[PDB]
Design a protein around this ligand. Structure first.
Ligand SMILES: COc1cc(CNC(=O)CCCCCCCCCNc2c3c(nc4cc(Cl)ccc24)C[C@H]2CC(C)C[C@@H]3C2)ccc1O
Ligand SMILES: COc1cc(CNC(=O)CCCCCCCCCNc2c3c(nc4cc(Cl)ccc24)C[C@H]2C[C@H](C)C[C@@H]3C2)ccc1O
Ligand SMILES: CC(=O)N[C@@H]1[C@@H](O)[C@H](O)[C@@H](CO)O[C@H]1O
Ligand SMILES: *[C@@H]1O[C@H](CO)[C@@H](O)[C@H](O)[C@H]1NC(C)=O
Ligand SMILES: *[C@@H]1O[C@H](CO)[C@@H](O)[C@H](O)[C@H]1NC(C)=O
Ligand SMILES: *[C@@H]1O[C@H](CO)[C@@H](O)[C@H](O)[C@H]1NC(C)=O
Ligand SMILES: *[C@@H]1O[C@H](CO)[C@@H](O)[C@H](O)[C@H]1NC(C)=O
Ligand SMILES: *[C@@H]1O[C@H](CO)[C@@H](O)[C@H](O)[C@H]1NC(C)=O
Ligand SMILES: [Cl-]
Ligand SMILES: [Cl-]
Lengths: 531, 532
């Protein structure tokens, strides 16, 4: 009855789950596409064929095939991102958390996980939708999509491996929500898509892509935007990486059909094992198989679409964390360690900026170095460390997002910008890494409300305020309740460019997030590199 | 007797002048070269032919022909720099102040005036050597040299207008000091040359030039260095400007001989009236006729000479002022005024940096703008004004001098670096201009010791400390007195890069003078301009 729901594709049976001394309904692992296996590897998704009988939706689905991190085996801080379910190419499923009793027609939020387009699972403990659905009375969906080569191998001109199919997976799950969420008590006219990292880029990509725009109402982008330098490649570079993937696997490279046929006969892990070898440079914060600017999902360049206003005009809420770059330095740059303060020598600083800006010529490298070096104190290992941290986060996350937010706000219907700079009391990563890429997610999903996780009382308060901002924005297009007595998160406007800090202190309003460095990254350096 | 001196070129009769309730000897207007007039215009100087009888050295000489500033007529702050004597091409004279009684063999200091190589006079009130000669017991010489086209018109390959003749004027006066200062109580083996602005650049050029190195012992450079961007041109650019000067005056341009013959028939003011017209850009802090890198006075490029250590190895003392740029903005850039705080709009800021870096492409201007703009507060007229001020001073004075000091110290025998950041209490210019290009000179020459000039008691002490640093350095190669109990001015070293502030407060040591901006001007921007 409450757990038995008839959808347009067939019947589903959910499960009653406990949450904070109450219960809600969970529908886990609902299929929304045909399994993209066999000759359907690299292909656009096809809708799931209707099934007879009752789909048992009491269990999380498989996770998509992906590179599994083994840098710190058994360490909770890194394992919490790895697939916690069996991996399979049969992975196109979504999960729904529904308040109990079922609401009539309530706001829908659809989570798009991140992971650089190479990793990610809907089933991670930090993406458990039950705290947000219960506390804010929303229908919380989490979708999945093919990652890595399976989702973003791109041989433009081919219909067998066109590229962007992971974005099409997301779109087909949004289409499924549009057609079916009403049967779960959700309003298909009030769907907010939100995501972090590649999920945030994806959200912005659906804002841009005409074929996506009518499948959601408004959007939240966390630490990611569609114009990020890691988030797309040209059709020529996507083809080169695809060909290099076959070369790494002794494939016939004389035609698309032969290359594709060879790659389709490999086991998933054979592709994954060489995935990182197709990158053009030694780099950090670069991923092999990402969306392509193809002339179809994206009709023109992202920059020209942003300039012309050729995107969905709605409300957006978006923001960044204080130390986006630290995790990438830890994993990929010399002198960084999980178990030390990672003071960086000048020689390791210079190596880090070459890894961080891999496309830069020597003059561009000099420019980055000068912009981020204190020449009164150039051997200060802390300043070198934090300088490199800033380089990675500004270039890869903050300044791309600020470019997006400024272009979008020119045509949009309301922008809200945040700067998340709270370091969790119970963080397992060292202090030098600061406020890490991904670590606002646990506040967005209400994990500080779980007494056993040992967050402080004010972190619970911060999580509750963030969930209420996100949900109230989802319901209304404004994170504020306008008749409340609480401090108001102001609109971001072209002129005054206001944002708020998100942390445990009373609200502060600021202006021009990281404006100085983002002039460097968004205006000066591109002009230098194009000279 | 004390005033009657027999030099190698003839007898000279000086005069007894008052100085601070005492007296000393002054020999004013001694000729050291033949008058470079008529067909000797543009030529190298020739030694003054000996004279019979007694040369009357009681009176300042004429000043060389130069552009005269009329922006603020009668205003003391500008008039103090203009010629205070009749202008004439017959201007190659030097002045000497000797302590009384005449010392046996004391330290000599030779002042080389600045003025962008287009202007300047040995006779300005602020260059009066009597206070420094008296207070520090030194023989103080001030030379002169042709400026403008008369000193620096360069048609390389012509022996009639070869270029650099103003530098050769300075050398001829140094040669004269070498040969004759012993007759005035000076030691020709302990001569310190010092100068400000173009005079500081000149001092550096004599350090570089093989033909100058044996005519002095040590050097002081004030707000100028030989590698400054305004201080020299290539032989091609010098020839372009010489031809363009002829074009402005309807001259035959077919040959050097015909062009020079035309230019020698013009009256001095005719050349001066069009002098600024030959600059290749709208700019500030650029001057038309300047030293040329000719392969003769300078055997190779300045940078190669600095890199190879092909220069005189000795002790140097040098430094800069806090606000070198402000004077040039006042006279040449939109939005600046003597009579207001000169808050600068962003539109006038952008025009200013274009005028300040005339040789930069658009990417270069963008780089300058980014380095000096606070994009949290870009419509702040005060920040825009001070940012422009810093750009001008950093690009034209401070960073070129820091490049020189770092290159020199690698081979030299002792570097002392100062940063002069005191604003005179009686300053006549507005507060926004800060510590102006030229305004350390009055402290170097002891004017605060003159009660009628209304400096504070603290400023008199600063001047006496500066005079003592300068003269003690001249005597010994070290500004510090050995077993003194006062705080010590440390050697600038490649590694620690120490310098001192010069102001009324107790001396403080710092390191790496404007290092961040000078990485930009000395390394990044040149690499950007060369690459784009
Ligand atoms: C390319 O550079 C320019 C080109 C132009 C175009 N110029 C013209 O049309 C000619 C008119 C501008 C001529 C300006 C002459 C000013 C010389 C005044 N002498 C001073 C001097 C010094 N300091 C001064 C400080 C103040 Cl506040 C005021 C005057 C000072 C210190 C000196 C250095 C000098 C270069 C000149 C002289 C001695 C204008 C300005 C420029 O900067
Ligand atoms: C060919 O040259 C290259 C060769 C290589 C070689 N690369 C390799 O061998 C593999 C290195 C990739 C290691 C993958 C680690 C997975 C990170 C796990 N996910 C995290 C995630 C987030 N935050 C994390 C924060 C910390 Cl402190 C730790 C992990 C986080 C937030 C997310 C965004 C992500 C991109 C991944 C995931 C979700 C790399 C670069 C090159 O240029
Ligand atoms: C499961 C599997 O490997 N199927 C392959 C398919 O990928 C390929 O395109 C096709 C071409 O004939 O051959 C099949 O055997
Ligand atoms: C559905 O799956 C759950 C989890 O294993 C199980 O407890 C339940 O009995 C299943 N119901 C069926 C198969 O009808
Ligand atoms: C959003 O659009 C509505 C509808 O036209 C308009 O009235 C409102 O002013 C817009 N708000 C913003 C912040 O653009
Ligand atoms: C929280 O703290 C208690 C004691 O303070 C400890 O026993 C418990 O294991 C902690 N919880 C976690 C998840 O570490
Ligand atoms: C030298 O000249 C000055 C002024 O021109 C004059 O007063 C003085 O008498 C002259 N001396 C002699 C000896 O002629
Ligand atoms: C100057 O040279 C002398 C003689 O070689 C040497 O003893 C002295 O250390 C040098 N001083 C500096 C500061 O280089
Ligand atoms: Cl930190
Ligand atoms: Cl707006």
């Amino acid at each position: 009855s409450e757990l038995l729901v008839n959808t347009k594709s067939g019947k589903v049976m959910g499960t009653r789950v406990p949450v904070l001394s109450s219960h809600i309904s969970a529908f886990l692992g609902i299929p929304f596409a045909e399994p993209p296996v066999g000759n359907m590897r690299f292909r656009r998704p096809e809708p799931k064929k209707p099934w007879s009988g009752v789909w048992n939706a009491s269990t999380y689905p498989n996770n998509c095939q992906q590179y599994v991190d083994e840098q710190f085996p058994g360490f909770s801080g890194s394992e919490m991102w790895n697939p916690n379910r069996e991996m399979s190419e049969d992975c196109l499923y979504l999960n729904i958390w529904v308040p109990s009793p079922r609401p009539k027609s309530t706001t829908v939020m659809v989570w798009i996980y991140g992971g650089g387009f190479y990793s990610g699972s809907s089933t991670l403990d930090v993406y458990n939708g039950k705290y947000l659905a219960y506390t804010e009375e929303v229908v919380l969906v989490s979708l999945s999509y093919r990652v890595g080569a399976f989702g973003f191998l791109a041989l433009h001109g081919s219909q067998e491996a066109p590229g962007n199919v992971g974005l099409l997976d997301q779109r087909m799950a949004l289409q499924w929500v549009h057609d079916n969420i009403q049967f779960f008590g959700g309003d298909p006219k009030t769907v907010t898509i939100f995501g972090e990292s590649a999920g945030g880029a994806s959200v912005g990509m659906h804002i841009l892509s005409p074929g996506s725009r009518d499948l959601f109402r408004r959007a939240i982008l966390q630490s990611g935007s569609p114009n990020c330098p890691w988030a797309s490649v040209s059709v020529a570079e996507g083809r080169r990486r695809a060909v290099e993937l076959g070369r790494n696997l002794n494939c016939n490279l004389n035609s698309d059909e032969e290359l594709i046929h060879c790659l389709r006969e490999k086991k998933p892990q054979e592709l994954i094992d060489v995935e990182w070898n197709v990158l053009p440079f030694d780099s950090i914060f670069r991923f092999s198989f990402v969306p392509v600017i193809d002339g179809e999902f994206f009709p023109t360049s992202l920059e020209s679409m942003l300039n012309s206003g050729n995107f969905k005009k709605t409300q957006i809420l978006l923001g960044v964390n204080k130390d986006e770059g630290s995790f990438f330095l830890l994993y990929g740059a010399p002198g960084f360690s999980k178990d030390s303060e990672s003071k960086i020598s000048r020689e390791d600083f210079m190596s880090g900026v070459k890894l961080s800006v891999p496309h830069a010529n020597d003059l561009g490298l000099d420019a980055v170095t000068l912009q981020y070096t204190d020449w009164m104190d150039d051997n200060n290992g802390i300043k070198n460390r934090d300088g490199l941290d800033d380089i990675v986060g500004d270039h890869n996350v903050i300044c791309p997002l600020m470019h997006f937010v400024n272009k979008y706000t020119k045509f949009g219907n309301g922008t809200y910008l945040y700067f998340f700079n709270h370091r969790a009391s119970n963080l397992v990563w060292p202090e030098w890494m600061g406020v890490i890429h991904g670590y606002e997610i646990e506040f967005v999903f209400g994990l500080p409300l779980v007494k056993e996780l040992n967050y402080t009382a004010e972190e619970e308060a911060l999580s509750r305020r963030i969930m209420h901002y996100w949900a109230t924005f989802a319901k209304t297009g404004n994170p504020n309740e306008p008749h409340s007595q609480e401090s108001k998160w102001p609109l971001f406007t072209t002129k005054e460019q206001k944002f708020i800090d998100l942390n445990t202190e009373p609200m502060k309003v600021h202006q021009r997030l990281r404006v100085q460095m983002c002039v460097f990254w968004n205006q000066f350096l591109p002009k230098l590199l194009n000279a």
